[PDB]
Design a protein around this ligand. Structure first.
Ligand SMILES: [Xe]
Ligand SMILES: [Xe]
Ligand SMILES: [Xe]
Ligand SMILES: [Xe]
Ligand SMILES: [Xe]
Ligand SMILES: [Xe]
Ligand SMILES: [Xe]
Ligand SMILES: [Xe]
Ligand SMILES: [Xe]
Ligand SMILES: [Xe]
Ligand SMILES: [Xe]
Ligand SMILES: [Xe]
Ligand SMILES: [Xe]
Ligand SMILES: [Xe]
Ligand SMILES: [Xe]
Ligand SMILES: [Xe]
Ligand SMILES: [Xe]
Ligand SMILES: [Xe]
Ligand SMILES: [Xe]
Ligand SMILES: [Xe]
Ligand SMILES: [Xe]
Ligand SMILES: [Xe]
Ligand SMILES: [Xe]
Ligand SMILES: [Xe]
Ligand SMILES: [Xe]
Ligand SMILES: [Xe]
Ligand SMILES: [Xe]
Ligand SMILES: [Xe]
Ligand SMILES: [Xe]
Ligand SMILES: [Xe]
Ligand SMILES: [Xe]
Ligand SMILES: [Xe]
Ligand SMILES: [Xe]
Ligand SMILES: [Xe]
Ligand SMILES: [Xe]
Ligand SMILES: [Xe]
Ligand SMILES: [Xe]
Lengths: 391, 391, 391
């Protein structure tokens, strides 16, 4: 119970929900005007399909009775037997799933069939997210190995980042991706999405303590810290490479946010500083590398969330401070934690990429992921929604 | 008291406030570029005029000493004698009134005099809202008959929906409403308003428990449920009728949100599913019907809130689950609740429509509701605000 | 401790953070399309540089051990020795600093070097904000004289308002400021920023009680009151002077918000009414005066926050109601409070203006504040960020 604790998590749940459309705007501003509605619409659909699957069985498969430590049962299907605290928990977690699917839409920007997205999205929820959530937070085998993930560096960031990479590769580059660079139609729209993501992350990392306590407070402090540091890094890089674009600055902060998520509740401020410092560097390099290889993993869910989540989940095993939340990492005389994290990160990264790959091809073969080239031409707002963003 | 309870309601109050401009954006994106500022401006004015009337006497007339069970006294004028908890309550409720007036602006889109709006708006607050709030939440006669309305299916949705229909009919169609269909100038702007409405509804329905407790938690769960279901319905309908526009999807979710509001704290998840399922269907049919009849109830406050609120208030008498919050409906061996709801819905729907009708004509006759046709031509941003939305 | 209290402040911190980009949007909509990204980007950078300086030493210099009652020590550098409650406090306050720097960007709209801004901004934080925060909230000499500032009428509004005036004068008018009046490129964008500022102020004033208690509740009530009153005033003025623009309406509300901030937790509703009534009048006159004198203090941080904060800080000494929060002003038989406020307002206004003036010239001489005239021509989005707002 604890009224303050329910108050805070009630709030945190509202805050994470906001992050879903928040992703839609963040992404929409980066795509062409002819796909603006589609990019946002996608985040909204993600929310809708997630709520339904989560209640239906998604929540159960994640936190229901464990089987072979890799998945939960159906004892909670249609929330059968979920009450009081569990209901709030079920809800808070529901929102984590939704955001994950939204981040994912990075890989299909400007060229996917909504129906295929819904289909692939529902399957990914079932065979990738639910499993991960269970492995780490539902008493799964990874939790058993002693792995940790405070707010979802793996469950959310690694999964979407790598799943997005696989999907990007499966669906193929956007027409002209190579010959010409696509221009953002509304940076301000993206910045509005960015502001909503920073604001909502308070509930994300800070709500992960499941109580208005000291852990949450620490999570909030380090979360803002890692974010500022990584934002500063991309600002210096941008300057060093020419001019400090705003897109670079917010993408830098987001990298810092993703990296700190798995560790928000275990590390101290100084650790938050290195986590963010490194995240800015690696994610940026990751972005350049993915770009160099000509992969159209469009809005860098991979380079930023995939990579940012990976480093952070690992950094947890290095910097976990017993002083902060009991746990300790290598730096604090505990080699084991690092091993558990390495194992965890290894498994989750490989699974997310390979299984997503399978799923994409499966759906692609079964129904086809991409829209016709002419639809891609006139834009998905018109072709997939029969709508027009602006007039 | 209870710090957690005050914390949560403090938050819920901020969340409902956000919904007012949230309505302005939601609507603004649906009107032409020449009326964008006006559509938003209206929601802002609604907030301002409401705060002032509420404190002045609005709050008192709603929750002050009852007279003949149909209205409250002036014992709270200028909040005379309102302290501690009451102050917080007074505030939370103030925000409910504001949102109501904002939804209402649906019926006057692109052709009303701000001054007339303020006037009509202030009168509606006095003779429609305050009464309704008192009847149901201020110990009025409807409460006596045993009627219920958890978060405002009647007090807020039915009232605005039907009052909007009356006003729409009084003010007349927009020039060209018939010959040509008006196009939204910025769907993304509307989606931003939509995201703000979903997010704020957490405080709306979830804050209606007046405590960070299990009822609130249930309200939050079912609220998201009804919303997802109804959003899914309009998505299928849209697909079935062609393409799934984003406007249809969010209007579907909103229908689900309005329908669940009166019941958020009394029904279970399965009930939330039927409430949303049905809401999507009826509101959509209502929209088509209002359209068929050529009524320019512009942004479907009526079809969506009016109808969505009506069904939901009734559904309360059918699905109220004793298990959930003590109360039971027909389905749970209690025919009475249904009768109280039917009576309640009957009275509130008829009053809102007829009294609003009177008020509109009165103001129209006294000062005139509509702008000149040339002002309608150049747009109200320019003619009513001497401003220009975009450059 | 108190879970509800931590819950509420956790929320309030997220809410104040939102206000930073909220300022960016509010301002961005008022500048030309070619500077939109820059105006927003600035608010984001403010956040980033503040978080870093605050932790680094900013927080310590403000609330660390006092020396000669005018500044704090370094006992908290890198948050050395800051834990539990202090951490939350440190965070909440961090956000106050960030917002302050953002408001400030009013004076440099459309013509400053980001690098110079960062530099000047970091120096201002150190020698103006930290001092003020310490003087009033860190047990500084002003607190000793018995001065009060509930949510920052002086620490935040007076400081930014006057510092903005000085900077405006130092950097010089925008090319063409005189011959032609600059037009807002997106009023709706500004209104989105305005809605975010009203919403976040709940955490600002309401969170300043540092507990989900009666003071917070009162702060929230009066905050909404002063805001509505001042918004109404500018609405009447606008009408009286022609048409009620939306920009005028929100600027009016903001004036009311700034004026009530220093008093949010000490006055009653009736006092909130006069504070807002007067604020609307003075700030408007201040705006006209600053305009008359041809000063390009661009987005009226001065006329609105500077002046609004000044009046409010003074009004505190006149209306403080013992009934409300123990303290009493002149009107309540206590001449002393007024004197402490007058002294406080006198010192803070003079310091902010003169020291900022020094700092501006210093940086200007050291590196130069303004961009080349050609950069000003093509716009800072392109020249300072190598980006383009819309396509
Ligand atoms: Xe994102
Ligand atoms: Xe999903
Ligand atoms: Xe699922
Ligand atoms: Xe929980
Ligand atoms: Xe897809
Ligand atoms: Xe996907
Ligand atoms: Xe961000
Ligand atoms: Xe931000
Ligand atoms: Xe928001
Ligand atoms: Xe995210
Ligand atoms: Xe955060
Ligand atoms: Xe890659
Ligand atoms: Xe609405
Ligand atoms: Xe009103
Ligand atoms: Xe009223
Ligand atoms: Xe309350
Ligand atoms: Xe009107
Ligand atoms: Xe109205
Ligand atoms: Xe919505
Ligand atoms: Xe949404
Ligand atoms: Xe609404
Ligand atoms: Xe909700
Ligand atoms: Xe109708
Ligand atoms: Xe809260
Ligand atoms: Xe919140
Ligand atoms: Xe501002
Ligand atoms: Xe700063
Ligand atoms: Xe600082
Ligand atoms: Xe605090
Ligand atoms: Xe500057
Ligand atoms: Xe500055
Ligand atoms: Xe927003
Ligand atoms: Xe505002
Ligand atoms: Xe607002
Ligand atoms: Xe502000
Ligand atoms: Xe507020
Ligand atoms: Xe001035």
């Amino acid at each position: 119970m604890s009224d303050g604790n329910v108050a805070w998590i009630l709030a945190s749940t509202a805050l994470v929900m906001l992050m879903v459309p928040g992703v839609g705007f963040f992404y929409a501003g980066m795509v062409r005007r002819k796909n603006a509605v589609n990019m946002i619409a996608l985040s909204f659909i993600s929310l809708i399909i997630t709520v339904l699957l989560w209640i239906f069985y998604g929540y159960s498969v994640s936190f229901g009775n464990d089987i072979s430590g890799i998945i939960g049962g159906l004892n909670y299907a249609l929330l059968s037997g979920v009450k009081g605290e569990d209901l709030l928990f079920m809800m808070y977690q529901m929102m984590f799933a939704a955001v994950t699917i939204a981040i994912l839409t990075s890989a299909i920007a400007e060229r996917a069939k909504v129906s295929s997205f819904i289909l692939l999205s529902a399957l990914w929820l079932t065979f990738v997210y639910a499993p991960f959530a269970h492995w780490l937070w539902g008493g799964g085998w990874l939790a058993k190995l002693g792995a940790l993930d405070f707010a979802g560096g793996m469950v959310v960031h690694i999964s979407s980042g790598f799943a997005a990479l696989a999907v990007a590769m499966t669906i193929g580059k956007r027409a002209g991706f190579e010959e010409y660079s696509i221009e953002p139609h509304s940076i301000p729209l993206t910045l509005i999405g960015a502001a909503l993501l920073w604001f909502g992350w308070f509930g994300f990392n800070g709500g992960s303590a499941l109580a208005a306590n000291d852990v949450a407070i620490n999570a909030v402090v380090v979360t803002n810290t890692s974010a500022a540091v990584a934002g500063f890094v991309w600002m210096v890089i941008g300057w060093i490479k020419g001019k400090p674009g705003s897109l670079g600055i917010v993408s830098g902060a987001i990298a810092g946010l993703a990296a700190i998520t798995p560790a928000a509740g275990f590390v101290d401020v100084k650790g938050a500083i290195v986590i963010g410092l490194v995240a800015g560097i690696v994610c940026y390099l990751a972005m350049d590398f993915r770009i160099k290889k000509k992969i159209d993993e469009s809005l860098d869910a991979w380079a930023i969330h995939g990579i940012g989540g990976l480093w952070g989940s690992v950094a947890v095993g290095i910097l976990a401070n017993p002083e902060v939340n009991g746990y300790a990492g290598l730096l604090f005389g505990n080699p084991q934690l690092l091993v558990s994290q390495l194992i965890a990160v290894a498994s989750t990264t490989a699974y997310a990429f390979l299984v997503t790959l399978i799923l994409a091809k499966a759906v692609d073969a079964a129904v086809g992921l991409r829209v016709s080239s002419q639809e891609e031409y006139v834009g998905l707002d018109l072709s997939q929604h029969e709508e027009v963003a602006y007039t």
